[PDB]
Amino acid sequence: TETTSFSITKFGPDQQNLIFQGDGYTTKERLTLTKAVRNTVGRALYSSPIHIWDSKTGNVANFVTSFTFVIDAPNSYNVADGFTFFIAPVDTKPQTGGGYLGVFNSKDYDKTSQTVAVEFDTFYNTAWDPSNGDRHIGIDVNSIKSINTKSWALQNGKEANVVIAFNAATNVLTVSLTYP
């Protein structure tokens, strides 16, 4: 059996167990992924690779992760692009910025991306998003085109708590986000 588990309640300046990419770094004891400045991209990864399945046995793994985050726009009308929790190959590197959230490259399903991602998306990019033009949560596997969505009303500047879990027996991935 193998487990890996970790918690970081407070983010120090030198958070050496995180790999940072783009302008992501830690500050005011938060992990700042972007600041309110156009066109940027920030990702941060946990330094250990995680064994999520195994080819000699066929067993797959369950996982749970929870985190609290804030989105900080100036008005609830001028906000983009969103934020992501994602599982990807050991060696992932930033991908297209903007509406693709630095995690995917085409809306076209790409078997070589092999990254699934949970997005908390704030800007409507007409080519691949729910037609009602709402902000939303969604599950993405290999495309920025979510396989499934649920409308979400961003509370700008409010911390939100989210848990995401996955159970290998039923292959179900569950996403909870709740503004307190």
Binding site: F11, A36, A61, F67
Partner: protein, 47 residues
């Protein structure tokens, strides 16, 4: 206020045996600061 979503997504079809988990964020013509305040994670894989 809560929002929940569930789906079946057989991760063994999509991701490699070893992976790295992480967060991502981006702006484009419009912007917002995106910040995480805490993060807990646990996984287990029987043998």
């Amino acid at each position: 206020t809560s929002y929940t979503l569930n789906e079946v997504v057989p991760l063994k079809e999509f991701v490699p045996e070893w992976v790295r988990i992480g967060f991502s964020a981006t702006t484009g013509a419009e912007f917002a600061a995106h910040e995480v305040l805490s993060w807990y994670f646990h996984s287990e894989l029987a043998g």
